[PDB]
Design an enzyme around this catalytic site. Sequence first.
Site, PDB file in Angstrom:
ATOM      1  N   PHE B  54       0.818  -1.214   0.000  1.00  0.00           N
ATOM      2  CA  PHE B  54       0.000   0.000   0.000  1.00  0.00           C
ATOM      3  C   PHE B  54       0.857   1.271   0.000  1.00  0.00           C
ATOM      4  CE2 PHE B  54      -3.280   3.021   1.989  1.00  0.00           C
ATOM      5  CZ  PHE B  54      -4.168   3.039   0.947  1.00  0.00           C
ATOM      6  N   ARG B  56       3.672   1.779  -1.505  1.00  0.00           N
ATOM      7  CA  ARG B  56       4.080   1.963  -2.886  1.00  0.00           C
ATOM      8  C   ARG B  56       2.910   2.498  -3.728  1.00  0.00           C
ATOM      9  NH1 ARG B  56       6.921  -2.739  -1.299  1.00  0.00           N
ATOM     10  NH2 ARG B  56       5.423  -4.221  -2.158  1.00  0.00           N
ATOM     11  N   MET B  57       1.731   1.945  -3.654  1.00  0.00           N
ATOM     12  CA  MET B  57       0.553   2.521  -4.292  1.00  0.00           C
ATOM     13  C   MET B  57       0.344   4.015  -3.917  1.00  0.00           C
ATOM     14  SD  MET B  57      -2.264  -0.481  -3.726  1.00  0.00           S
ATOM     15  CE  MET B  57      -2.301  -2.017  -4.609  1.00  0.00           C
ATOM     16  N   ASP B  59       2.596   6.268  -2.566  1.00  0.00           N
ATOM     17  CA  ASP B  59       3.671   7.000  -3.235  1.00  0.00           C
ATOM     18  C   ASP B  59       3.537   7.080  -4.755  1.00  0.00           C
ATOM     19  OD1 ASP B  59       4.793   7.066  -0.734  1.00  0.00           O
ATOM     20  OD2 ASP B  59       6.292   5.517  -1.267  1.00  0.00           O
ATOM     21  N   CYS B 162     -17.647   6.247 -11.939  1.00  0.00           N
ATOM     22  CA  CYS B 162     -16.647   7.188 -12.230  1.00  0.00           C
ATOM     23  C   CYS B 162     -16.763   7.957 -13.553  1.00  0.00           C
ATOM     24  CB  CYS B 162     -15.371   6.359 -12.376  1.00  0.00           C
ATOM     25  SG  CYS B 162     -15.047   5.452 -11.070  1.00  0.00           S
ATOM     26  N   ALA B 306      -1.912   6.099 -13.838  1.00  0.00           N
ATOM     27  CA  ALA B 306      -1.547   5.197 -14.934  1.00  0.00           C
ATOM     28  C   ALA B 306      -2.478   5.391 -16.109  1.00  0.00           C
ATOM     29  CB  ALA B 306      -1.539   3.739 -14.470  1.00  0.00           C
TER      30      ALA B 306
HETATM   31  C1  LIG Z   1      -2.134   2.140  -8.387  1.00  0.00           C
HETATM   32  C2  LIG Z   1      -1.215   3.111  -9.170  1.00  0.00           C
HETATM   33  C3  LIG Z   1      -1.467   4.501  -8.524  1.00  0.00           C
HETATM   34  C4  LIG Z   1       0.272   2.712  -8.930  1.00  0.00           C
HETATM   35  O1  LIG Z   1       1.061   3.472  -9.839  1.00  0.00           O
HETATM   36  P1  LIG Z   1       2.004   2.646 -10.654  1.00  0.00           P
HETATM   37  O2  LIG Z   1       2.698   3.617 -11.540  1.00  0.00           O
HETATM   38  O3  LIG Z   1       1.245   1.756 -11.543  1.00  0.00           O
HETATM   39  O4  LIG Z   1       3.034   1.866  -9.692  1.00  0.00           O
HETATM   40  P2  LIG Z   1       3.537   0.373  -9.580  1.00  0.00           P
HETATM   41  O5  LIG Z   1       3.471  -0.235 -10.956  1.00  0.00           O
HETATM   42  O6  LIG Z   1       4.910   0.195  -9.054  1.00  0.00           O
HETATM   43  O7  LIG Z   1       2.489  -0.455  -8.709  1.00  0.00           O
HETATM   44  C5  LIG Z   1       1.706  -0.193  -7.564  1.00  0.00           C
HETATM   45  C6  LIG Z   1       1.011  -1.378  -6.949  1.00  0.00           C
HETATM   46  O8  LIG Z   1      -0.227  -1.717  -7.616  1.00  0.00           O
HETATM   47  C7  LIG Z   1      -0.632  -3.018  -7.409  1.00  0.00           C
HETATM   48  N1  LIG Z   1      -1.710  -3.380  -8.313  1.00  0.00           N
HETATM   49  C8  LIG Z   1      -2.425  -2.600  -9.170  1.00  0.00           C
HETATM   50  N2  LIG Z   1      -3.359  -3.291  -9.843  1.00  0.00           N
HETATM   51  C9  LIG Z   1      -3.245  -4.598  -9.399  1.00  0.00           C
HETATM   52  C10 LIG Z   1      -3.903  -5.791  -9.759  1.00  0.00           C
HETATM   53  N3  LIG Z   1      -4.891  -5.890 -10.653  1.00  0.00           N
HETATM   54  N4  LIG Z   1      -3.486  -6.928  -9.123  1.00  0.00           N
HETATM   55  C11 LIG Z   1      -2.479  -6.830  -8.191  1.00  0.00           C
HETATM   56  N5  LIG Z   1      -1.817  -5.779  -7.813  1.00  0.00           N
HETATM   57  C12 LIG Z   1      -2.241  -4.659  -8.448  1.00  0.00           C
HETATM   58  C13 LIG Z   1       0.654  -3.788  -7.538  1.00  0.00           C
HETATM   59  O9  LIG Z   1       0.702  -4.992  -6.779  1.00  0.00           O
HETATM   60  C14 LIG Z   1       1.720  -2.750  -7.151  1.00  0.00           C
HETATM   61  O10 LIG Z   1       2.430  -3.093  -5.912  1.00  0.00           O
HETATM   62  P3  LIG Z   1       3.950  -3.555  -5.923  1.00  0.00           P
HETATM   63  O11 LIG Z   1       4.962  -2.544  -5.696  1.00  0.00           O
HETATM   64  O12 LIG Z   1       3.954  -4.783  -4.926  1.00  0.00           O
HETATM   65  O13 LIG Z   1       4.340  -4.396  -7.040  1.00  0.00           O
HETATM   66  C15 LIG Z   1      -1.424   2.820 -10.691  1.00  0.00           C
HETATM   67  O14 LIG Z   1      -1.367   1.476 -10.764  1.00  0.00           O
HETATM   68  C16 LIG Z   1      -2.875   3.206 -11.080  1.00  0.00           C
HETATM   69  O15 LIG Z   1      -3.048   4.393 -11.446  1.00  0.00           O
HETATM   70  N6  LIG Z   1      -3.745   2.187 -10.946  1.00  0.00           N
HETATM   71  C17 LIG Z   1      -5.155   2.651 -11.272  1.00  0.00           C
HETATM   72  C18 LIG Z   1      -5.831   1.961 -12.432  1.00  0.00           C
HETATM   73  C19 LIG Z   1      -7.310   1.892 -12.196  1.00  0.00           C
HETATM   74  O16 LIG Z   1      -7.965   0.955 -12.638  1.00  0.00           O
HETATM   75  N7  LIG Z   1      -8.011   2.795 -11.523  1.00  0.00           N
HETATM   76  C20 LIG Z   1      -9.496   2.437 -11.467  1.00  0.00           C
HETATM   77  C21 LIG Z   1     -10.257   2.922 -10.240  1.00  0.00           C
HETATM   78  S1  LIG Z   1     -11.327   1.662  -9.529  1.00  0.00           S
END
Ligand SMILES: CC(C)(COP(=O)(O)OP(=O)(O)OC[C@H]1O[C@@H](n2cnc3c(N)ncnc32)[C@H](O)[C@@H]1OP(=O)(O)O)[C@@H](O)C(=O)NCCC(=O)NCCS
Lengths: 387, 387
Positions: B54, B56-57, B59, B162, B306
């Site tokens: 969490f 990492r998410m 940050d 959303c 993302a």
């Molecule tokens: C979450 C977010 C802020 C993280 O930013 P990021 O640039 O992607 O960063 P990271 O790739 O290093 O990953 C963050 C964490 O997300 C987790 N994650 C995201 N989606 C996941 C999934 N479907 N299953 C498992 N883990 C998931 C990962 O496990 C990861 O943790 P980690 O460091 O153990 O590996 C980015 O993933 C994001 O914007 N996700 C949103 C996408 C979305 O669908 N939003 C919809 C709203 S309901």
Amino acid sequence: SVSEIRKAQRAEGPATILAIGTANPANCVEQSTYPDFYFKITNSEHKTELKEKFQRMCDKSMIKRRYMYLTEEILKENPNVCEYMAPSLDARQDMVVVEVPRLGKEAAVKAIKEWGQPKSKITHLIVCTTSGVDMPGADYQLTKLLGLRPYVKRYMMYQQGCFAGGTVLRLAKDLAENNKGARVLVVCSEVTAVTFRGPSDTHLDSLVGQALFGDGAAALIVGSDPVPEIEKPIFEMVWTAQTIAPDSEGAIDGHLREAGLTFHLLKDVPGIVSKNITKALVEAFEPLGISDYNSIFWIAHPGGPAILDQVEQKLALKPEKMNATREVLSEYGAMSSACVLFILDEMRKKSTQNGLKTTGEGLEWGVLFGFGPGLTIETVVLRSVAI
Amino acid sequence: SVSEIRKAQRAEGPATILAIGTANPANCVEQSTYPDFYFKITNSEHKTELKEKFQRMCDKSMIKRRYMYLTEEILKENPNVCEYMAPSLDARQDMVVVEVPRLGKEAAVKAIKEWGQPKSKITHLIVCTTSGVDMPGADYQLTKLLGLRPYVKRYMMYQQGCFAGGTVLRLAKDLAENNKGARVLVVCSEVTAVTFRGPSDTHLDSLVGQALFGDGAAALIVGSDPVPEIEKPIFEMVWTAQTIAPDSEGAIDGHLREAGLTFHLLKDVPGIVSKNITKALVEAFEPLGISDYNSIFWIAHPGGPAILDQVEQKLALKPEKMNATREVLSEYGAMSSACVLFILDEMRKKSTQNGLKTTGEGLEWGVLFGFGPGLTIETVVLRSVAI
Ligand SMILES: CC(C)(COP(=O)(O)OP(=O)(O)OC[C@H]1O[C@@H](n2cnc3c(N)ncnc32)[C@H](O)[C@@H]1OP(=O)(O)O)[C@@H](O)C(=O)NCCC(=O)NCCS
Ligand SMILES: CC(C)(COP(=O)(O)OP(=O)(O)OC[C@H]1O[C@@H](n2cnc3c(N)ncnc32)[C@H](O)[C@@H]1OP(=O)(O)O)[C@@H](O)C(=O)NCCC(=O)NCCS
């Protein structure tokens, strides 16, 4: 540029109802024997006074039968649904997130067949329900079930209540009239599985809902600029309004809780509706120069018979004005939003079948009323169609 | 007769946004320290691996803070809300049936002040929320709280999700354009009290929602035929669309249960959005002769960073296109339907404050995107206003 786009984008004529189709769950529940079924299925046979009270409500209801998704076999597998107030929303939700779009689907396929045009010409989709909520919603499920195009523009109206048969029409009017070519599929699908509950002698208002509510869906195709001799107008929408009656705070409230959807009646609904109906009528028909309410065709949400009788008494409407509305009350009970749509169906079929000159019982101008929480009154002004 | 009524009833020009006002709960929650607060408030400190995940998410989220109705004091009185999945809908519902209209109210009073016209000229009211449902709904509560007229025409959009910042605009366009004089108050009010829940290591998708979602309301006044030098246009709506991306069944699902609203991510949202955005863009701007997506102003629901980064990469948008969207993500997090409305506010204020020639960053044509369950994409085509 933007004004040229605006001129080319918009339709020309009044939103017209071009097909109506209805569906109901296959389980038919006789009203006459319903107090014995309901009091036994909810383990309440010991409550004699209450039962008697409920038999009088069912006998006074002017409902002969209702169609219900809930069966005894479903009710024996969900005793928490049979109690007045037990945790049971996940069970109810699982029934209605599926049943709503499935029943909706049945109704829409009939309307689409009557309309006759390719379903890919459906540009907008309004789904209306008071039972269950889900994401993606029933609009998305129905798009998928019917094979509609993926870009259909969706309007998901959740938890609206008993006036929303007038809302969907009010909405459909502005979508059809402002968009050239637009063809609106309107689906109102109401399953009472979310509201069924056992009886309690200190919540008689909740008991009234158990005598009156029944299930069903209706679907319309709404459009402006019909293609003559290809599409066949049934009614035309001219004007709408929505209003909240004074002094009616809490008249019809309904809360979605962990124990399901509960309904509470805190004022006098029949007397609030009667008292305010004249106001609604003058705001609608005074600009049309009409003041004789026996000269227009009627459609009224039959929230039970007392609403109807007290409106008829108030205005001195002939007994016959409420015939179609009461024929639907008799055969299906109060189906919440779908109810007034079954009444349009019932009126146009009867006028056509009996050789009358319009689909509006021979008359030109008509009114449809939606009554429900707020206390809310929805008014739609209609014009019939020749033949 | 009916055609003469139809001609006199309808507006002439494009629906225009004429005021925007926003509100947020007073509790500011820093994102940096949020994983320590959240893991302690949900008694999950023992879950080290999960916590790290969490942090990492949080940050990576590109969110600096969010405003939240839920406080530690509220959370210590509702441990069932703090668990991943405990019966808690009645508690959540009691928070949001009140908070939604109260926050909505704050936003609308600001927009109404900016608009400057009598509130009794408000003819239509669209309320949109994903938190809670009630009957009468939040539209009725807001009508009452604001003193609106009793006959305002109400549009209660419950449990939309959303993308519904684009829906409300799509709806408002057709109401303003088809009704002469109509002035639409649009309120999008989202409180995450319905979705907050504790962490679970086999439901990481649910954990992502806990890093990203935040609260807030926005209100607009929408109308066609502005009265020049009395009302002040901000943006004009030209065209809209809504569509469901192929291969996205279950990408963003959300069920309202006895344990509250849960969200589940079953596909790749960022990659589905990126993959489909070009299609949306060509359907919108190809009839406008525009193909260079760095020449229009952007508004994108920031469902996390993302989505934004993968859309920017896909199209080669300059980094600056997403500035306003990201400034709102940074300051408020993803506020569901309200989010894109805060971004219009953020863009027009910044363009005005910085002396640019339009409210659309100096540019003429703009796009707003809504992304959400289905996987649904809402597109609104905008034109800016000089000065
Ligand atoms: C979450 C977010 C802020 C993280 O930013 P990021 O640039 O992607 O960063 P990271 O790739 O290093 O990953 C963050 C964490 O997300 C987790 N994650 C995201 N989606 C996941 C999934 N479907 N299953 C498992 N883990 C998931 C990962 O496990 C990861 O943790 P980690 O460091 O153990 O590996 C980015 O993933 C994001 O914007 N996700 C949103 C996408 C979305 O669908 N939003 C919809 C709203 S309901
Ligand atoms: C229920 C209904 C079908 C009965 O028809 P009726 O012509 O009014 O018949 P009756 O007057 O003899 O009364 C029926 C029963 O309603 C009960 N009832 C109705 N509203 C009640 C209330 N607010 N408090 C207590 N009892 C109530 C009465 O106790 C009565 O039972 P009784 O024989 O012990 O005295 C009629 O009352 C009706 O149409 N009610 C619907 C009004 C309404 O608000 N519908 C909204 C849907 S949520």
